[PDB]
Write a protein that binds this ligand. Structure first.
Ligand code: SF4
Length: 66
């Protein structure tokens, strides 16, 4: 399984990740992104999250596997 994280101090709230992968990322009350799910097992969701991670203009996204 995978766990996605968005570094709140780094995120600039550009919403690219939410646009690309709305099942995985949402905007919060600070105007930053955060994961809308605490675990991913669905390969489609992981693949999307991986593309968002690669696209983030400020490198705020990381994905942990276990
Ligand atoms: S793509 Fe990166 S900087 Fe933009 S909202 Fe998502 S985590 Fe934040």
């Amino acid at each position: 399984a995978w766990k996605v994280s968005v570094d709140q101090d780094t995120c600039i709230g550009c919403a690219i990740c939410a646009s690309l992968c709305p099942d995985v990322f949402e905007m919060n009350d600070e105007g930053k992104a955060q994961p809308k799910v605490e675990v991913i097992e669905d390969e489609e969701l992981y693949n999307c999250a991986k593309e968002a991670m690669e696209a983030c203009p400020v490198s705020a996204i990381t994905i942990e596997e276990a």
